[PDB]
Amino acid sequence: LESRRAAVRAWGDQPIHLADPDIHELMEKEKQRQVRGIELIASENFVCRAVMEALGSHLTNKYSEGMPGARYYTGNQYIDQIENLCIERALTAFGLESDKWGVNVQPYSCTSANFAVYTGLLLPGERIMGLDSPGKKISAASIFFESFPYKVNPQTGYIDYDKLEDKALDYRPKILICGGSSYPRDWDFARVRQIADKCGAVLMCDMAHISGLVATKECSNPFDHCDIVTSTTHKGLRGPRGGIIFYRRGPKTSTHYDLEEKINFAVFPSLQGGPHNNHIAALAIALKQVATPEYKAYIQQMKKNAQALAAALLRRKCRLVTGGTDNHLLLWDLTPMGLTGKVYEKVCEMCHITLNKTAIFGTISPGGVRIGTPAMTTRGCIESDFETMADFLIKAAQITSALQREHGKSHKEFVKSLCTNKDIAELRNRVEAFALQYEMPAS
Amino acid sequence: ALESRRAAVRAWGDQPIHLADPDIHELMEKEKQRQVRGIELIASENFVCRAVMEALGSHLTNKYSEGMPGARYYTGNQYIDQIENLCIERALTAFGLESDKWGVNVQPYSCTSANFAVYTGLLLPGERIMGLDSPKKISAASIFFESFPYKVNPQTGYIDYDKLEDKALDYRPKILICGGSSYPRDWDFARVRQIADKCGAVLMCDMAHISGLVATKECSNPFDHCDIVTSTTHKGLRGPRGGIIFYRRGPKTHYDLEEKINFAVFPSLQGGPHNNHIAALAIALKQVATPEYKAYIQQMKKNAQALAAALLRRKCRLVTGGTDNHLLLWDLTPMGLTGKVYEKVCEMCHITLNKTAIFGGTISPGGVRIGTPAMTTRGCIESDFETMADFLIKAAQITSALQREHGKSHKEFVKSLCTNKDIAELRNRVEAFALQYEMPASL
Amino acid sequence: NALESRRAAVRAWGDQPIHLADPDIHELMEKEKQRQVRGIELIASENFVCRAVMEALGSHLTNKYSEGMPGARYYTGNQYIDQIENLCIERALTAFGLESDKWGVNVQPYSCTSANFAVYTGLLLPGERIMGLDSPKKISAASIFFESFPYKVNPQTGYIDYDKLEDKALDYRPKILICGGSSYPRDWDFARVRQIADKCGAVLMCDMAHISGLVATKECSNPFDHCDIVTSTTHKGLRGPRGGIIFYRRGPKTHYDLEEKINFAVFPSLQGGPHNNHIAALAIALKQVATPEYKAYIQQMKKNAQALAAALLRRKCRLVTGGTDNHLLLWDLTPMGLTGKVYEKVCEMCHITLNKTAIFGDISPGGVRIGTPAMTTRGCIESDFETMADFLIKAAQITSALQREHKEFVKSLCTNKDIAELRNRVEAFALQYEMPAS
Amino acid sequence: LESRRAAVRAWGDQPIHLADPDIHELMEKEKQRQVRGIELIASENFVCRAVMEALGSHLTNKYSEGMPGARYYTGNQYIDQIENLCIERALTAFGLESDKWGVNVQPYSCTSANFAVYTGLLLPGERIMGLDSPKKISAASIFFESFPYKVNPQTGYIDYDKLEDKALDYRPKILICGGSSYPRDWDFARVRQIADKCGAVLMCDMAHISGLVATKECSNPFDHCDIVTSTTHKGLRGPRGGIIFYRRGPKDTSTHYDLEEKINFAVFPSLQGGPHNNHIAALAIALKQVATPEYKAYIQQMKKNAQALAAALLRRKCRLVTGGTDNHLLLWDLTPMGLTGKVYEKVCEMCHITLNKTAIFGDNGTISPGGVRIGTPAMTTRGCIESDFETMADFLIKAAQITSALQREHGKSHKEFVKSLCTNKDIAELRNRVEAFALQYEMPASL
């Protein structure tokens, strides 16, 4: 008996560094990469320990198909209380009342969440209209429904609400979507509502890129005008990877809102199985923390940092789409320096700087890069720190011009050159040195 | 002021869960306790080892990895790539597959998600599929495609492969699916292949319920006959919650599945993968390839025969009159009990089960589904299951007794449950029993 | 007078006869009129129409566009065309013993296919499920735009297996269940099919194309006693003009929902204006259906089919189901080692038109489909069919003889003595019988 | 024998006027209506006798499922030769060569034809874009995704810039020009440039201009479009039905055209059954006649007649959409006279004048119900010339003068209006003038 009891404990309580050294080594190398590098991907962020402790818990052991108080399986009395608590905290986070709004927190991702709304509200093939980043059908939404997307004014970079109104009145989509893409300026949610109303569409906002700013009233509030708001749990909110759906409830021929039953059912049982109980606990923790002054200050600093960085790059002759930002992210046009994002991205990578090329405009040039403050803001960077980072971003560009010039016609021989360049190796060292000056949550 | 804000980050980032969120921590602890102090007979459920939790609750959740290894949307994936690549190698090794004949996508958020990616990848919306059914349109598969399911023979409880051949030749579905439901007997995958080939259908297996038995060659091998196998990562395999897709590659001119499925998963249907889940999966798959694991499965099946034998001896009725695997369908209608109520009384006695659909020929609500994987993991053996059997009967004897006296009203019933001495006595016997067995990962 | 000169130029053009206005076409039309008279017609579809019908077709009615429904037209000037369509409708109900309070009828459909598709389009959302009989990648537009799970006859018996149908329908739960359709040589148990439809909650539709004649004359099962919708072709049994027609139930069962949906599907969804000339022609044909003469025409048609069946059985031939309840025969040639594909082409050379058909293998290419209506119309009687049976055998005996060498026999075909001899016998036979409208 | 052979002849040869008097009476009443009225519906025309003789023939007797030389049934030796001849005449009518263009002549209607093209080329649900005449109505919009475009509301002309913008956005598989009754020429060349930019197949529905196109009296869509569909019975004075022209042989991946097999198959067996052999013969006759100088001179007069009518109405202070026409039809705005088409239409009917109210964009950017559509082809066919149309203009105004007068006195009820209509002196007087006018003109095929 006691022999078997020890056999279980042996296996069950064996640490990762013993149970799987090969993985453990890779995890440690990746932890080091994270610490010794700058993170400028506007998506990315760093989570606190408590969120990781929630993820890495016995909650993964319990299958909980269904909703709180209406599960497929017995034993969910404590998982219900967690999900419920997670819900309550989601409303309070966005200053919502339970009589006017409900929320489903099971969606495996933001993509997943959006598609559930469409699945729930629409018959297959019905029409939707949302923003777009400039076989041939890519998103599942565009496969299983009829997506006619809209785009930003190619000259201004801003949204043209007038063309949008024309377009929407003509296409009469069942669902109109705002948010979605990485847009560096505030939305006129009020306006989009007027449009939605005119063409008899349901207004949805995908607030993934602004979840942080919305909760902290540091941008326009879509909850004031949309019938549905989806989001990512892990960007602004520094929660775990997943999605979430807010919908209206109770009164507005239609007497009351019809959303809750349809959406809940679409998530489960239509599209998903059980939820990730561990993700939900993690999410509740993250959402408790969003409702704090500490988090408000975090977002405020995030935005000050973004202006600091914008100002820095304009001072250095750079071209920003719209000439700046209202929020936490920058679209930087490199074509005036004669660079594509594709290559600048890959040089920055060699120098421990992570960013990502983006689509920019009146043809579609491959010469944009997308940058955001949240990650380094989380590591305690302030306005002067971002002024430093700017210098690194310019040195990287100066190198990139210099290398394209010497290697004018080498597709293979260019990637090799990278690994033995002295100016890269110098900048990489400056970046690692810089990076180590800032703390890294949960070590 | 620099060192003061470097401590404010550390303060927040390194705060343990029991401080950061006591309300959540208390619930997490109550659930850990529940798991320890009860019997788990849900055939889905299992308990994961610590290393798997440590993977989940890690800095890997910080990095967004949209795309595939070597072909990501974002820079910085050098180490995540090596982990995903390792997780893939281990998945093949686990199921005795060679990389030139098979490939595997490990990103699917769930087994449901995985199946749906297969359909989305291979078929045009509205095209036809056929699979088993557990006795409006409910599944997303049946919403966006044409599902004509097949069923087990209502008298036998076994599958009728002749009626299946008839139905498949008539409907000529693009994809024919075996596995799926909790079926207590072995599949004739060889036969189903003959049928697929006749009606020109791609043969897919959903090996969610038998993932374990398949890897250990302790049941029929669907990889010997199917072109695609999907599965859940977290049932047999004691990995993290998610799904996985195996597909054939190279010469049969060649297979057409890899590009189509990978693309469906991303970018069509999902965003970025759960890097934490993927590491945790790699660890779980390393452990499947061990003798310990093969012995684990062997014991799991011995325990199932032990439990079947015990119940038959006690005049119970089992669908098909036993099992070839790890699970049991128990018909309670001969004792005059519905699964709905027996389920809820077992819950009150710390026994977790779930009512199931079974044929009586009408569908009776008097089935319940039991499996051995969970208690087998905790180091239970044949004689322990014989003890558990005694509890299952004492629970049934109480349920009959209660239905009789207080079955008149659902309210008057639930009251008697909360305040019954025989329940409380058997609950104590179960907790006492339960605590004798280890519980993997007690911090 | 430049006025009068113009007035003449118009009359000159407008009254020029076909034989002057287009000799090339006229010559081909004359050659075809000859072919029709000097041949035997055993295609079970085909029939010959009366002069009055042709006069309606070739009239000023083709000049007036009438988009819409009677008394609800898009265009002015329809006062008389309305009276014609309304009359055609009343005559269609009368023909099939229906009352206007319980049934309505749309007579605009350009064809029977067009008519079936309008019902589907009218009642169903694209992609919803239908089930109908099939003659043993996606071909029909019904199977393209909707989800068609077809059923088939029992391969051994050649009769319909209503038990297997019930099982298949309860499984597939189609929004619409369809009976009739294919050329089936036995009566339908419409009563049974209803029972099934009702069980799987489907709308019962009958395609009465093949049997339109028999049904009107109560010389077979009446689908109007059991179906909610009956479609048909106007030009088979009925000896009307080419087109289709839709009957649907109206008023209480709360009330039927078919009329507005189906009318709208036909127009404006699927077609434009109706062929006013075809409708008048149809009205004429339907007045004539309602007569004892027509009943006697159908009676003879069936006696003629039994006469032919009997004649071929006596001659060792194999008929699917071993006969017929109606006007058409499925003849299995595989016991004589022949494919339809070839027999068909030989019969053609001998001025005998019939058509190869799908039949089940004990799935063989060795069936041909034969019917009485065409020759029955020309005044053929039982003994005349017994003569035709001889011709059919002599055609077969020739076909076996020529399949000795094998493609290569195309020369032999053109220059064969036995063919020429039988062709002459058939032309001589054919010229004995009148040909409506000369 | 001979007694049964006479019983068939008795039935088979019975003339219509004996076989069915009730129908015959109505048919005769309608023939009279056609003769004793003015036809200004731009669609309508009158066919010659030869065409009627084709329609009302033994050809209806033969079922010809399939295509020439590839039929389902035997006995089609001659039917084939007719269809083949109809096809050759269709090509020669529009100046096309068989190596570069093919044509399917089975479509039961022009609607039917358009839908076959869509069915043939596109998967259900794929995208098309076409013009619209100001719930899902057309089957095209039910079974496929139709995002239509419209004329500039102020100008009444098409806005090719807004059309380019819209097409590049929506990227439809098939872009369609023609369609509506449009009184001005199309810039097919321009529409081609657009199609090419958004990678769409360019289709023209030439139903309303079939006549002008054949006679090179308007822009030629065959010079630019990959597919041209049409109605057989409007300009061409053929029988009612449709027809599909598609390109053949050589034109990134696309080496040769892929249209013929897909379209033919969509027509049959997908959508239709057998063709109307009698319609096809009639069509062949009609198309022979289109390729003559007589027919060219017909179209020429048709257009001179239109200018004559436009000029006439302008001179009497009428308001025309786009201020005139390049073709055979006229959109007339009545809102300056305070009239709706819906009522003017119904008064004109009473006076033996057939036209039809039409959707127009008004002086306001709104959609007024105040338009009517008029054309010359029908009365042109009956031998009317310019001065005759100036007469018909006088009738149209008198009718309007009456309609205002009536709306003023008897507007109170729709029942008290329809009475006044039946029993009005000024109507009766104008009805007489119109009948008297109409009988001056020949009516083709009055035997």
Closest CA to D229 of D115, D98, D82: D115
CA distance D304 to D386: 7
Cβ contact D345–C80 (<8 Å): no
The answer for D 23-52 residues in CB contact with C (under 8 A) is 23, 26-27, 29-31, 33-34, 37, 39, 41, 43-52
**Which CATH code, of 3.40.640.10, 3.40.50.10260, 3.20.20.300, 3.40.50.300, is assigned to C68-290?**
3.40.640.10
Top residue of D132, D146, D169, D253 to mutate, by most chain A CBs within 10 Å, is: D169
Beta bridge partners of A71: A66
Q: Which of B126, B170, B171 sits opposite C127 (nearest CB)?
A: B126
Which sign does the torsion angle of CA A115, A119, A121, A124 carry? positive
Tokens of A303: 């935005």
With an 8 Å Cβ cutoff, is B6 touching chain A? yes
Mutate to test the interface with B, among A45, A58, A105, A419 (most CBs of B within 10 A): A58
Half-sphere exposure of A345 (CA within 13 A, CB side): 21
Whether C271 and chain D come into contact, CB under 8 Å, resolves to yes
CA-nearest of B305, C339, B270, D323 to A232 is: B270
Closest residue in D to A167 (Cα) is: D166
Closest Cα partner for B102 from B226, B188, B209? B226
C377 within 8 A of C48, measured Cβ to Cβ: yes
Taking an 8 Å cut-off on Cβ atoms, the answer to whether A171 and D147 are in contact is: yes
How far off is chain D from C163, nearest CA to CA, in Å? 31
Whether chain A has a CB inside 8 Å of the CB on B120: the answer is yes
Q: Which residue among C32, C280, C434 sits closest to D62, beta carbon to beta carbon? A: C32
A439 closest CB neighbour out of B6, B61, B271 = B6
CB D407 within 8 A of CB D66: no
For chain D, the chains sharing at least 3 beta-carbon pairs closer than 8 angstroms are A, C
Q: Tokens 């087994």 correspond to what residue?
A: B111
A91 and chain B in contact, CB less than 8 A: no
Positions of C annotated as catalytic residues are 65, 67, 207, 233, 236, 242
Compute the half-sphere exposure of residue D151: CA atoms within 13 Å on the CB side of its CA: 25
Angle at the Cα of D266 (from D262 to D268), degrees rounded to 5?
Answer: 120
What residues have CB less than 8 Å from D225, skipping those under 6 apart? D177, D188, D192, D202, D203, D204
d(CA D223, CA C156) in angstroms, rounded, equals: 58
Question: Is A63 one of the annotated active-site residues of the chain?
Answer: yes
Nearest CA in chain B to A243: B271
DSSP B155: T
Residue A358 appears among annotated catalytic residues: no
Distance (Å, rounded) from C-alpha A293 to C-alpha A288? 11
Residues of D in contact with A144 (CB under 8 A): none
Distance CA(C270)–CA(C118), nearest Å, equals 7
The alpha carbon torsion through A137, A140, A144, A149 (nearest 10 deg) reads -60
Whole-angstrom distance, CA of residue A414 vs CA of residue A408: 9
Question: Do C426 and C40 form a contact (C-beta atoms < 8 A)?
Answer: yes
State the DSSP code for B136. Answer: -
Contact A148 D125 (CB under 8 A): no
Question: Which class for B409: exposed (0-12), middle (13-18), buried (19 or more C-beta within 10 A)?
Answer: exposed
Class of domain B59-289: alpha beta
Min Cα distance A162 → chain B (Å) is: 31
CB contact under 8 A, C353 and D4: no
> Six-digit token pair at D284?
């062949």
D149 catalytic? Reply is: no
Instruction: Please provide residue D442's backbone torsions phi and psi, each rounded to the nearest 5 degrees.
Output: -60, 155
**Which residue of B148, B151, B166, B172 to mutate against C (max C Cβ within 10 Å)?**
B148
Nearest to B378 among A8, A59, A143 (CB): A8
What angle, rounded to 10 degrees, do the helices at B78-94 and B275-288 form? 30
**Of D23, A384, A117, D220, the residue nearest C83 (C-alpha):** D23
Rounded Cα distance between D49 and D239, Å, is 11
The one-letter amino acid at A329:
L
Residue in chain A closest to D143 (alpha carbons) equals A125
Rg of chain C over all Cα atoms, to the nearest angstrom: 24
Distance CA A332, CA A313 (A): 9
Return the CATH number of the domain spanning residue range D58-291. 3.40.640.10
Secondary structure letter of residue C266 according to DSSP: I
C-beta of residue D76 within 8 angstroms of C-beta of residue D64: yes
Q: A273 touching B, CB under 8 A?
A: yes
User: How many CB atoms are located within 10 Å of the residue A364 CB?
Assistant: 13
- Out of B146, B167, B170, the one facing C147 most closely (by C-beta) is B146
Question: Who's near C387: CB < 8 A, 6+ residues apart?
Answer: C429
Residue whose C-alpha is closest to residue A54's, from A302, A289, A236, A379: A289
Taking the C-alpha atoms of residue D22 and residue D25, their distance in angstroms, rounded to an integer, is: 5
Neighbours of chain C (3+ CB pairs under 8 A): B, D
DSSP B257: -
Distance of alpha carbon D394 from alpha carbon D316, whole angstroms = 9
Q: With an 8 Å Cβ cutoff, is B361 touching chain C?
A: no
Solving technique: X-ray
Is the preceding peptide bond at A269 cis, omega within 30 degrees of 0? yes
Neighbours of chain B (3+ CB pairs under 8 A): A, C
Q: Is D58 helix (H, G, I), strand (E, B) or coil?
A: helix
Listed by number, the residues of chain A in 158-197 with a beta carbon closer than 8 Å to a beta carbon of chain D are: 167, 170-171
| D63 interface with A at CB cutoff 8 Å | no
Tell me the shortest Cα–Cα distance from A362 to chain D, in angstroms: 13
* Chain C CB within 8 Å of residue D62 CB: yes
Token reading at A419: 């690994």
Closest to B121 in 3D by CA, of B134, B131, B108: B108
Nearest to A8 by CA among B443, B375, B288: B375
Number of H helices, E strands in chain D: 18, 15
* Interchain pair D169, A148: CB under 8 A: yes
**DSSP at A325:** -
- Quick one: tokens of C113? 């296919």
Residue contact D147–A125, C-beta within 8 A: no
Show residues of chain C in contact with D60, CB under 8 Å: 49, 53-54, 57, 235, 241-242
Tell me the shortest Cα–Cα distance from B163 to chain C, in angstroms.
Answer: 12
> Is there a contact between A60 and B56 if contact means CB atoms under 8 Å apart?
yes
Q: How far apart are CA D31 and CA A172, in angstroms?
A: 47
Which amino acid is present at B65? Answer: S
Which chains border A (3 or more CB–CB pairs < 8 Å)?
Answer: B, D
Please give the radius of gyration of chain D, using alpha carbons only, rounded to the nearest integer: 24
For D125, list phi and psi in degrees, rounded to 5. Answer: 90, -15
Q: Which residue of C has its CA nearest to D271?
A: C141
Which residue in D205, D226, D333, D345 is the catalytic one? D205
